[PDB]
Amino acid sequence: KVTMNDFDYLKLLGKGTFGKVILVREKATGRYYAMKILRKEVIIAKDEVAHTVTESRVLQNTRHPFLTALKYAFQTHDRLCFVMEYANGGELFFHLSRERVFTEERARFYGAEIVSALEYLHSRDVVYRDIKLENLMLDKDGHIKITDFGLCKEGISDGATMKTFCGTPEYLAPEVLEDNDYGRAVDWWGLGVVMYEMMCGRLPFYNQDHERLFELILMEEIRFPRTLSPEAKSLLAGLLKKDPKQRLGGGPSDAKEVMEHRFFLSINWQDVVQKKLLPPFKPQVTSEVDTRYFDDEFTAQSITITPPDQRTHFPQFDYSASIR
Amino acid sequence: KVTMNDFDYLKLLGKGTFGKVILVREKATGRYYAMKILRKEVIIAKDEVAHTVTESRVLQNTRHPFLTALKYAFQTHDRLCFVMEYANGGELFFHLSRERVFTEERARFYGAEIVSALEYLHSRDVVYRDIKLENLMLDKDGHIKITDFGLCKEGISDGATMKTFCGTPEYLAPEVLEDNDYGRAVDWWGLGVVMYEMMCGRLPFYNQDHERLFELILMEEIRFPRTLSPEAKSLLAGLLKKDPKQRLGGGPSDAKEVMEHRFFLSINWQDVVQKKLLPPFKPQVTSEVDTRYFDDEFTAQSITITPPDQRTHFPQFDYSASIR
Ligand SMILES: CCn1c(-c2nonc2N)nc2c(C#CC(C)(C)O)ncc(OC[C@H]3CCCNC3)c21
Ligand SMILES: CCn1c(-c2nonc2N)nc2c(C#CC(C)(C)O)ncc(OC[C@H]3CCCNC3)c21
């Protein structure tokens, strides 16, 4: 049984209201991982139990080069811990914040890998629902690693629907901002937003006030830099079509519509999944504990245990990759 | 009732996440022993209660020249303590790390003594499950003393099976890396790995990542130095057969298959158990407190009590060798 003192706790990689993520060393092997630590108290209060159990359940059976691999899922009396692959290259958000914009070529590389992962998830009836730059990390070679599966939905095949109002506001599809249910096409909209950010250096829609933001998402016409290629303009127009039935990827062939798009004309899709495409950017990390692609805001902070206030057991948190 | 203050605490012999082992002097007699000290908090959190109770229960009834003898098992409000024979000669891991390789002759001596112990344990339906160089120590005369019985299973006769995924990764048998249950043949595989190490100066399989390691154990063909004897190659090929049914020692005659192997052609097995075989290496210790065959990393450290945070009683921890 895996416990807290099986790991050394080295650096804070990220923190939010959800909890915290820490660079750990596994004592027994000396190998480095990221550990997401969540307080059960917060999870229950927020009504996120089912979502968090689902996060473990999906990760236990997913295997794909561009999804983050789970090593352990374990828990204590007051905490839930995910031990997972450390994405040395950090978030795409980090890189785009520094570089401001990616070339169409570089965006195409990341985009092809995200499309590959979303095809795989959708084939297994999983809707990810949280595509954003913050959840798109890079491994040490510069390949995509999708992280944070805390808003996934299972059992969603072509035409099936979902009702939970969830996601990140700036990335929410217009149909989610309407009453009743929505389908898997929301993931393609999400790819639309991140592709737009990568090539245009800004969100297609933004206001600090969510009420204004959601009106923009529902109502505003997207704009493009004049210099963008016709097929990049076509790709983003198709992914960010407000009607999910008319959206690129929103038909019965799902990822195939996106894969066959003229923006990805140069891409051989079997090379993508086989990791044969060369990353344009290779993270220049020089050790296993190197956190240069993570914000100082987090890594400067000292690690500190929070004071707490019968069975408090969560299912799906006694998992090991060695055992299943 | 035996207590903590009945002993002087002299030198740290070894430490891990499990707990610590200290060289102690029994105040009343002035005799020296090793004391393994475990924290109940850690044992409970790790779900190792049954394993630790078993460790005491097995040691209370075992008697064989090459098994470490338990003097006392006792407990405090937050600790469990094993007082046992101090193996002055240290671990085989220590000696092999220094010398790099043993001659086939010296490997044969240690191998014979381990086989004798494993025969004895298996005859009493005990599977040891943790055969490794770290657990193979030497007494002051140079004879084998198996230590650390914390992964034993009782009641395992010929054909009976076990389900717990436990052991040390580098020493795990291939069948343990498959679903469902495994038999007592795991111990002969374990002997295989230690014999290989002794004669070939490396583990037959190694990778720092366990996922890679387990694939090697399941899939990789073992290699031998060209100079190894035909019967050494044969012994190792037989003990390290991936199929437990085809493995040397894996039949209904158990240790007899191994004892009758041509590598041990020179061995009289009754002389082995009667300790009439001369150790090739005699520990050159010059006093009862001499810890030259223990790593400085441990013995340089000062002895320190850890701060803690109703009945917390463990059964099988009221044992004395004078009383049963
Ligand atoms: C700290 C960033 N971060 C990371 C990693 N950081 O380095 N390698 C990582 N992997 N993993 C996560 C997960 C996760 C997960 C699973 C796979 C269990 O679903 N959820 C959330 C994360 O941040 C969220 C916020 C933290 C604050 C800054 N931006 C991102 C993760
Ligand atoms: C520190 C080494 N060590 C020793 C001895 N050291 O000198 N004489 C010993 N005996 N005994 C044990 C036991 C035990 C036991 C019973 C018989 C109660 O089952 N478990 C574990 C030990 O280390 C584990 C690790 C410690 C770190 C270095 N390598 C070995 C022992």
Short mmCIF file of N, CA, C and O and ligand atoms in Angstrom, two decimals, chain A residues 13-16 18 21-22 34 36 55 59 68-70 82 84-88 90-91 134-135 137 146-150 294 298, ligand 1:
data_model
loop_
_atom_site.label_atom_id
_atom_site.label_comp_id
_atom_site.label_asym_id
_atom_site.label_seq_id
_atom_site.Cartn_x
_atom_site.Cartn_y
_atom_site.Cartn_z
N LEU A 13 5.03 22.67 -8.06
CA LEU A 13 4.92 22.89 -9.50
C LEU A 13 3.72 23.77 -9.84
O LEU A 13 3.75 24.53 -10.81
N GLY A 14 2.67 23.66 -9.04
CA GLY A 14 1.45 24.43 -9.27
C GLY A 14 0.47 24.27 -8.12
O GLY A 14 0.47 23.24 -7.44
N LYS A 15 -0.36 25.28 -7.92
CA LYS A 15 -1.33 25.29 -6.84
C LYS A 15 -2.58 26.05 -7.24
O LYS A 15 -2.50 27.05 -7.97
N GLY A 16 -3.73 25.58 -6.78
CA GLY A 16 -5.01 26.26 -6.99
C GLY A 16 -5.99 25.89 -5.89
O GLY A 16 -5.60 25.27 -4.90
N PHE A 18 -8.36 23.80 -6.11
CA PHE A 18 -8.43 22.34 -6.21
C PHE A 18 -7.48 21.65 -5.22
O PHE A 18 -7.85 20.67 -4.57
N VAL A 21 0.16 20.51 -6.79
CA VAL A 21 0.94 19.54 -7.55
C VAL A 21 2.41 19.75 -7.20
O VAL A 21 2.91 20.88 -7.24
N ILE A 22 3.10 18.66 -6.85
CA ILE A 22 4.47 18.72 -6.35
C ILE A 22 5.38 17.75 -7.10
O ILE A 22 4.98 16.63 -7.42
N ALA A 34 5.39 13.77 -10.85
CA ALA A 34 4.51 14.80 -10.30
C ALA A 34 3.43 14.12 -9.46
O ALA A 34 2.94 13.06 -9.83
N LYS A 36 -0.28 15.08 -7.74
CA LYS A 36 -1.39 15.98 -7.43
C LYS A 36 -2.02 15.54 -6.12
O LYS A 36 -2.44 14.39 -5.98
N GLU A 55 -11.69 10.67 -12.78
CA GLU A 55 -10.32 11.04 -13.18
C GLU A 55 -9.39 9.85 -13.02
O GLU A 55 -8.63 9.54 -13.92
N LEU A 59 -7.92 7.28 -16.22
CA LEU A 59 -6.46 7.15 -16.29
C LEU A 59 -5.97 5.70 -16.13
O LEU A 59 -4.94 5.33 -16.70
N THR A 68 -1.09 11.90 -20.21
CA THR A 68 -0.24 11.68 -19.04
C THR A 68 -0.55 10.32 -18.41
O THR A 68 -1.71 9.99 -18.16
N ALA A 69 0.49 9.53 -18.17
CA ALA A 69 0.34 8.20 -17.61
C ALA A 69 0.33 8.27 -16.08
O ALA A 69 1.19 8.91 -15.48
N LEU A 70 -0.67 7.63 -15.48
CA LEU A 70 -0.81 7.52 -14.03
C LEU A 70 0.01 6.33 -13.51
O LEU A 70 -0.13 5.22 -14.01
N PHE A 82 -2.58 11.58 -6.73
CA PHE A 82 -2.24 11.02 -8.03
C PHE A 82 -0.74 11.15 -8.23
O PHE A 82 -0.22 12.27 -8.20
N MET A 84 2.04 10.69 -11.09
CA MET A 84 1.97 10.67 -12.56
C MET A 84 3.28 11.13 -13.21
O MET A 84 4.16 11.67 -12.55
N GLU A 85 3.38 10.91 -14.52
CA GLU A 85 4.53 11.37 -15.29
C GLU A 85 4.77 12.86 -15.10
O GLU A 85 3.85 13.66 -15.27
N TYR A 86 6.01 13.23 -14.74
CA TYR A 86 6.43 14.63 -14.67
C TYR A 86 6.69 15.17 -16.07
O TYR A 86 7.59 14.69 -16.77
N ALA A 87 5.89 16.15 -16.48
CA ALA A 87 6.05 16.78 -17.79
C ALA A 87 7.08 17.90 -17.67
O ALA A 87 6.73 19.04 -17.36
N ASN A 88 8.34 17.55 -17.93
CA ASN A 88 9.49 18.43 -17.73
C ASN A 88 9.41 19.76 -18.49
O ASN A 88 9.99 20.76 -18.07
N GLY A 90 6.85 21.69 -19.04
CA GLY A 90 5.83 22.62 -18.57
C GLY A 90 4.63 22.76 -19.49
O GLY A 90 4.49 22.02 -20.47
N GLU A 91 3.76 23.73 -19.16
CA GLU A 91 2.53 24.01 -19.90
C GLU A 91 2.79 24.79 -21.17
O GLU A 91 3.67 25.66 -21.19
N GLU A 134 -3.28 25.53 -20.43
CA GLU A 134 -2.88 25.17 -19.08
C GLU A 134 -2.83 23.65 -18.84
O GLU A 134 -2.11 23.19 -17.96
N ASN A 135 -3.61 22.89 -19.60
CA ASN A 135 -3.69 21.43 -19.47
C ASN A 135 -2.90 20.69 -20.55
O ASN A 135 -2.95 19.46 -20.63
N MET A 137 0.68 20.03 -21.61
CA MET A 137 2.06 20.12 -21.17
C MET A 137 2.96 19.47 -22.21
O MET A 137 2.47 18.93 -23.19
N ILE A 146 -1.35 15.71 -22.39
CA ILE A 146 -2.58 16.24 -21.81
C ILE A 146 -2.65 15.82 -20.34
O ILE A 146 -2.47 14.65 -20.01
N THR A 147 -2.88 16.80 -19.47
CA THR A 147 -2.97 16.57 -18.03
C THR A 147 -4.34 17.01 -17.51
O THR A 147 -5.11 17.65 -18.22
N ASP A 148 -4.63 16.64 -16.27
CA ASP A 148 -5.86 17.03 -15.56
C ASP A 148 -7.13 16.50 -16.22
O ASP A 148 -7.81 17.21 -16.97
N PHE A 149 -7.47 15.25 -15.90
CA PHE A 149 -8.66 14.58 -16.43
C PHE A 149 -9.84 14.68 -15.46
O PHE A 149 -10.73 13.83 -15.47
N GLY A 150 -9.87 15.75 -14.66
CA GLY A 150 -10.87 15.91 -13.61
C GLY A 150 -12.27 16.33 -14.03
O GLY A 150 -13.15 16.46 -13.19
N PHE A 294 8.39 26.04 -15.31
CA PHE A 294 7.32 26.24 -14.35
C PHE A 294 7.51 27.62 -13.73
O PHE A 294 8.64 28.08 -13.57
N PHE A 298 5.18 29.57 -8.14
CA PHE A 298 4.93 28.29 -7.46
C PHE A 298 6.19 27.65 -6.89
O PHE A 298 6.21 27.24 -5.73
C1 LIG C 1 1.15 21.49 -11.93
C2 LIG C 1 0.69 21.15 -13.33
N1 LIG C 1 0.06 19.82 -13.38
C3 LIG C 1 0.64 18.63 -13.65
C4 LIG C 1 2.10 18.41 -13.96
N2 LIG C 1 3.09 19.30 -13.70
O1 LIG C 1 4.24 18.57 -14.17
N3 LIG C 1 3.94 17.27 -14.69
C5 LIG C 1 2.61 17.24 -14.51
N4 LIG C 1 1.84 16.17 -14.86
N5 LIG C 1 -0.20 17.57 -13.64
C6 LIG C 1 -1.40 18.11 -13.33
C7 LIG C 1 -2.67 17.57 -13.14
C8 LIG C 1 -2.90 16.31 -13.31
C9 LIG C 1 -3.31 15.21 -13.49
C10 LIG C 1 -3.84 13.88 -13.82
C11 LIG C 1 -3.01 13.23 -14.92
C12 LIG C 1 -3.81 13.04 -12.54
O2 LIG C 1 -5.20 13.99 -14.28
N6 LIG C 1 -3.70 18.38 -12.83
C13 LIG C 1 -3.55 19.70 -12.67
C14 LIG C 1 -2.30 20.31 -12.84
O3 LIG C 1 -2.16 21.67 -12.68
C15 LIG C 1 -3.29 22.55 -12.65
C16 LIG C 1 -2.84 24.00 -12.69
C17 LIG C 1 -1.92 24.33 -11.52
C18 LIG C 1 -1.63 25.83 -11.53
C19 LIG C 1 -0.97 26.24 -12.84
N7 LIG C 1 -1.60 25.65 -14.01
C20 LIG C 1 -2.12 24.29 -13.99
C21 LIG C 1 -1.22 19.49 -13.17
#
